[PDB]
């Protein structure tokens, strides 16, 4: 079940009321929102994209920071077993929450080294016109509470709790967060370098791929592939529309995106056009694209 201050959460319930009713949740929300955004460098960084998962331990020598960005209607979930330090950061978008939370629990339940507890963190979203962040918080709190293990909700800065307004238009306060693995500390962050194969991994989610695990903590490798997808319908039609009609249909929040999000869409749609089926074209021998952390903390191809 999902616990707050040692007591169980009664569901359904909005996160705003859940935070107001419990001081330590409000304490974390006031602090997290007041943080000036940090520019996290590429050293020791493991960037998680939308609909991706990454789990590791402080015993890792390569990775020391997990993080994700561009969370408008998504929720960046952080699960961590305190004591041993097994940390999992995923970028949940709500395509299939019923099957994604078991992926998060299993990523942590394999690390067994008893001591500590399970702490979960929920950040992102705003009050959008489509009630997407509200439905995603509902699903995430219900799937965690349906679990057997006791999970303690520590952070909950989502939707109404993460919303700001300019010119009578709403958009989120926190677009991304980084979590430092050695010290279990979460903070607002931006990411200039977003790891290798950005267009390949983004096109996988835009084509309709499911949530995947992108890091193997045993070998400390980044494993991108192999991916296969149906050719995206009407790639040339969307590659010729204006910026306004691109955000309205390819984005879950047309007016709440960070700048140059259309460039991200056009670049990603361009990738799907050149590679209609990347099954046996980008992955020779059907082996994944393997990466390891450099001496200088960068992702270098093996």
């Amino acid at each position: 079940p999902l616990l707050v201050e040692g007591r169980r959460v009664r569901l359904p319930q909005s996160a705003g009321d859940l935070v107001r009713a419990h001081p330590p949740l409000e304490e974390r929300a006031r602090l997290l929102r007041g943080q000036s955004v940090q520019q996290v460098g590429p050293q020791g960084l493991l960037y998680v994209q939308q609909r991706e998962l990454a789990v590791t331990s402080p015993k890792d020598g390569s990775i020391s920071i997990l993080g994700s960005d561009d969370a408008t209607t998504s929720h960046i979930v952080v699960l961590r077993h305190t004591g041993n330090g097994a940390t999992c950061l995923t970028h949940c978008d709500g395509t299939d929450t019923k099957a994604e939370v078991p992926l998060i629990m299993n990523s942590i339940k394999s690390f067994s080294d008893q001591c500590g507890r399970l702490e979960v963190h929920l950040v992102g979203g705003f009050s959008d016109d489509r009630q997407l962040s509200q439905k995603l918080t509902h699903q995430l709190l219900s799937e965690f509470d349906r679990q057997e293990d006791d999970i303690h909700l520590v952070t909950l800065c989502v939707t109404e709790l993460n919303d700001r307004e300019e010119n009578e238009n709403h958009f989120p306060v926190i677009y991304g967060i980084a979590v430092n693995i050695k010290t279990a500390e979460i903070y607002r962050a931006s990411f200039q370098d977003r790891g290798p194969e950005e267009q390949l991994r983004a096109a996988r989610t835009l084509a309709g791929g499911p949530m995947i695990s992108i890091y193997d903590a045993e070998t400390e490798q980044l494993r991108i592939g192999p991916y296969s997808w149906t050719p995206f319908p009407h790639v040339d039609f969307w590659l010729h529309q204006d910026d306004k009609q691109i955000l309205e249909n390819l984005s879950t929040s047309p007016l709440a995106e960070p700048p140059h999000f259309v460039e991200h869409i056009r670049s990603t749609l361009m990738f799907l056009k050149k590679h209609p089926s990347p099954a046996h074209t980008l992955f020779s021998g059907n082996k994944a694209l393997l990466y390891k952390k450099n001496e200088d903390g960068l992702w270098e191809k093996i």
């Binding site: 939308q50 609909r51 561009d70 969370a71 408008t72 209607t73 998504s74 978008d93 395509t95 983004a202 989610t205 835009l206 309709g208 249909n249 390819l250 984005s251 879950t252 929040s253 995106e257 990603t268």
Partner: peptide, 4 residues
């Protein structure tokens, strides 16, 4: 955010 991307709509699947």
């Amino acid at each position: 955010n991307l709509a699947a």
